[PDB]
Amino acid sequence: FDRTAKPVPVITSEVTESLEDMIRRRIQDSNFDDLQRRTLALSEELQKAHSEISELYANLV
Amino acid sequence: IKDMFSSAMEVARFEGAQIKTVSGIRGEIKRALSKPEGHYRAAFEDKILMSDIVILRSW
Amino acid sequence: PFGGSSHAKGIVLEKLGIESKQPNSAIRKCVRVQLIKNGKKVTAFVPNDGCLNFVDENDEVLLAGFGRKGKAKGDIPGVRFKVVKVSGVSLLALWKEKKEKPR
Amino acid sequence: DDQVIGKARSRTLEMRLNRLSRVNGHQDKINKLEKVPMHIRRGMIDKHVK
Amino acid sequence: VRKLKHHEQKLLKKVDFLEWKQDQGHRDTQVMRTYHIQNREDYHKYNRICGDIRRLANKLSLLPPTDPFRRKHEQLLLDKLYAMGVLTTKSKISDLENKVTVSAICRRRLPVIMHRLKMAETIQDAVKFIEQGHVRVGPNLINDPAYLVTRNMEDYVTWVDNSKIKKTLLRYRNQIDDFDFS
Amino acid sequence: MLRRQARERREYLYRKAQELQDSQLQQKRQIIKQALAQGKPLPKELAEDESLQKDFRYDQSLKQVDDEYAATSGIMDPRIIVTTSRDPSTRLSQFAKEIKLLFPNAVRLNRGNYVMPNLVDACKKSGTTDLVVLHEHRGVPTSLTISHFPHGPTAQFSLHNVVMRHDIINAGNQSEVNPHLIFDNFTTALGKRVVCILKHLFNAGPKKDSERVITFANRGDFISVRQHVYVRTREGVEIAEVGPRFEMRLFELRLGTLENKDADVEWQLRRFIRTANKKDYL
Amino acid sequence: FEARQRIEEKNKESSDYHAKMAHIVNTINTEEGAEKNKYERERKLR
C-alpha cells in the first residue's frame, strides 16, 4: 500500500558520529553563528550648502 | 474507525497508512486501539460524517 | 516538405514516449519513422493513441503533412507529419472498424 | 557626480533621463512642453530668434 | 451675473466675479469646509509650515546623492514628521516632498482624531463637544479645537470623567457604577 | 498600555501592506539606477512615466534581520519564562527545569490555575521577551511552543526523541555560561525565520573562548539540538555531550501571540496533501 | 523501516520520470523546430 508520512528518524551510532564530526569541524574552524552586539575638508561650496541647510533645518525643527 | 481489521497486531502492521473516504477526504490511520480489538484512530483533513465509508487501496 | 511528393512512405523505427503516464498526450501520440527515399529519420504524430496501438514496428507507414490551424495548449511545436496509412490500409478505417490490418 | 551640486546637478540628471526615455519612448509623451499662453510664447520665440 | 448672451460672452470671455485666479481653486476654503476649522489664518499658518518643509526637502535633494549629510538630515526629517503624525510612511523621501499637505496637518488636528476614533459621530459634533468641555487629553482638559495631537497622545485622548457623555455611554452598556460618580 | 499595543500593531500592519504594494516601485528605481550607471535605453513604461522620473532625485538619495526583532536585537538581553502545560507530571517538571537551565536569562513558572490571557498580559506588563510552554504525554515530552511577546510570532514545534540529563548518570551539573551556537543546514526562507527566532531566544554576544556550544542541526526537516562542552588539545578538539538531546520538528508558525488563536498563519505543516512526502521544509 | 524505504524509492522513480519526459520533449522541440524553421525560411524565399 502507500504511506502518507516519512516516519520519524531513529537515532543511530553513525548519525551521532556524523553530528560529532560536523561539530568537531566547526569548532576547529571556530566558525559559529551567534548573536552579536549592535555597537554605537569637504569643499568650499559643499560647506556653504551644508551651512545653509543646517540653519534652515534648525528653524523648521 | 471500527471494521477494517481484526486485531491491534494487524492495525500495528498497517499503521501510519493512507486512507480516504468515499466522500473524497483523505486521512491517515494513526494508532491501534486497546479495548476493542480491531478498532483504530485515524486523522482526517475535515470532519468525516457517520454516513460515510473509509477505504484503503491495496494491491 | 520532404521534397517532391505530398505523401511520403517510411518505416516505423521506434515509438517515442510510450512510457509517459497521462494518456492521449503529444509525446504519447508521437512516433519516429525513417523515410525510405533518403534513409532519414524524423518524428511524426499519429492521431488517437488507440491508433498508436494499431501502428507497431517495421511496418511501412505513409505520412502526410500535419497542418495545424492555431496553437494549442499542450501540443509539441515542431512535429510536422502525421501518419495516414499503415502498411497499405488507412488508420481511420482501422479505427472505425471497417477494415483489418494485413501483414 | 559626487562633487556636482545645485542647479547643475538638477539639469544634468534631467538631461540623462531625457536621453534614455527619448531612445525608447513615444515622442509626444516624451516631449510635451509646458503650457504658456499664445502671445507670451510667440513673444518669447521672437525675442530668442532675434 | 445675468448669464449674458453670446456676443457679450465673446467680448467678456475673461470676466468672473466669484472665482479669480489668486483664489487658488478656493482650496483654502474647501479644506476649511472639509475639516471644519475656524479661521483663514489657521489654513495659511499650516501652508507656511508645509512650504518650509518643502523647501528644505528641495535643498536636500539638490545636495549630491551619496552624501552622508544628505541621508542623515532627510532621515531626521522623515522620522520627525512620522512621529508627529503628518505623513504616514517613513520610507519615501519623495513623500517627504510630495505628500506633506495642509490636509495632513489639518487632520492630525483634534476633532478629526476624535471623529476617527469614533468618540464623535461627525467632525462638527466633535468640535461642539470640545467647545462644551467634555474632552481631556491626559489628565487635563483641552478646550481648543485646534489642538494637534500626535500619535503617542492619540493614545491618551479620553472623556472627562464626570461628563453626561460618559454616563450615557456606560449606562447604555448597563455598566454604570456610581461609586466613582461616573 | 494595551491601547498603545493596539495602535502600534495596527500601524505595523498598515506599513506592511504599503511596503508590499511599493516593492514594485523599489524594482523600478533599481532599473532607473542601472540605466543611469551604465546607460541603456529605458523600457517603454518607465520612459513614458513622468511622476517616477520626476521624483527620482529623492528616491535616488534612497538606499537583514527580521521585522519583529530589528529594534532590540543586540540591545536587550532577553528574559524568557519556561512554563509548564497545566497540572504537570513530575517528569515534565524535570524537563522544564532542564530547559530553564539550557537558556540563560530564563525563569521557571509552575502553571496552576493560570489562564492564558492573564499569563500573556502579566508577561507583557512586567516585560519578558519570550514564553516557552511545554506539553507531555505520560512523562514523555512531545510539544514546545515559543512566543515572542510584544505582538510577536509563535512557533509550535513537536519534540520526539527526548533523553533527559538526569536520565543519563550523575555526571555533575551544567556550566551555565553564555554559550556558542551552531545552526546547520538552515537554508530556505523559513529556515531563516526559525534560525532568527531561536537565535534571539538565546543571549547576545558570547565570549571568544567559552566552553559550551549548543547545536541545532537540520536533518531532513528534523532539528536536532545538543549541548557539547569542548576542550582544545594539541592536535584535536574533544567534546563531551551534555544537556538533553531530542529531535524537534516545527509544525506551525503563527503571527500573533499564543493566546490569540485567530492569528494570521504564516506556515502550517500539510499532512494529507498529495505531495507531502516529497518536499523538505514543507 | 519499510515505509521510509518505499517512500524514498518512490520519490526517486518520480524524479527520474520527470527528467526523462522533459529530455524527450526538449530534443523533439529543438531538432524538429530547426528543420521546420529552415524549410519555412526556404519556402518564404519562393
Q: Can you give a write-up of this model?
A:
- This is part of a larger assembly, with seven protein chains of seven kinds.
- Chain A is mostly helical and 61 residues long.
- Helix content of chain A is 54%, strand content 0%.
- With 59 residues, chain B is mainly beta.
- Chain B has one helix and four strands; from the N terminus they run H-E-E-E-E.
- Chain B has one helix spanning 8-13, and strands at residues 17-21, 26-32, 40-44, 54-55.
- With 182 residues, chain E is mainly alpha-helical.
- Helices cover 53% and strands 4% of the residues of chain E.
- Chain E has helices at residues 6-11, 27-35, 40-62, 68-84, 93-98, 102-106, 110-116, 123-132, 151-154, 164-172, and strands spanning 135-137, 140-141, 157-159.
- Chains in contact: A-B, A-D, A-E, A-F, A-G, B-F, C-G, D-E, D-F, E-F.
- At the A-F interface, helix 1 of A face strand 6, helix 7, strand 7, strand 8 and strand 9 of F.
- First CA to last CA of chain C: what distance? 29 Å
The level of helicity of chain C is 10-25%
Structural class of chain E: mainly alpha
The largest sheet of chain C, given as strand count, sense and whether it forms a barrel, is: 6 strands, antiparallel
- The count of strands of chain C amounts to 6
Over all CA atoms, what is the radius of gyration of chain C? 13 Å
Main location (chain F): nucleus
GO molecular function (chain F): RNA folding chaperone; rRNA primary transcript binding; single-stranded telomeric DNA binding; snoRNA binding
Pfam family, one (chain F): Brix
Function (chain F): Required for the early cleavages at sites A0, A1 and A2 during 18S ribosomal pre-RNA processing.
Can you tag this structure with a few keywords?
part of a larger assembly, 7 chains, F: 282 residues, alpha/beta, ten-stranded mixed beta sheet, 7 helices, 31% helix, G: 46 residues, mainly alpha, 1 helix, rod-shaped, Nucleolar complex protein 14 (chain G)
Secondary structure layout plus pairing:
The structure is cut from a larger assembly and holds seven protein chains of seven kinds.
Chain B: H1 8-13, E1 17-21, E2 26-32, E3 40-44, E4 54-55
Chain C: E1 8-14, H1 26-29, E2 30-35, E3 40-45, H2 49-54, E4 61-65, E5 81-86, E6 89-90, H3 91-95
Antiparallel strand pairs in C: 1-2, 1-4, 2-3, 4-5, 5-6
Chain F: H1 2-37, H2 44-48, H3 51-55, H4 58-61, E1 80-84, H5 90-102, E2 106-109, H6 116-126, E3 130-137, E4 140-148, E5 154-159, E6 180-184, H7 189-201, E7 212-219, E8 222-232, E9 237-254, E10 267-268
Parallel strand pairs in F: 1-2, 1-3, 6-7
Antiparallel strand pairs in F: 3-4, 4-5, 5-9, 7-8, 8-9, 9-10
PDB class: ribosome
Keywords: ribosome, 90S pre-ribosome, 40S pre-ribosome, A1 cleavage, Dhr1
Entry title: Cryo-EM structure of the 90S pre-ribosome from Saccharomyces cerevisiae, state Pre-A1
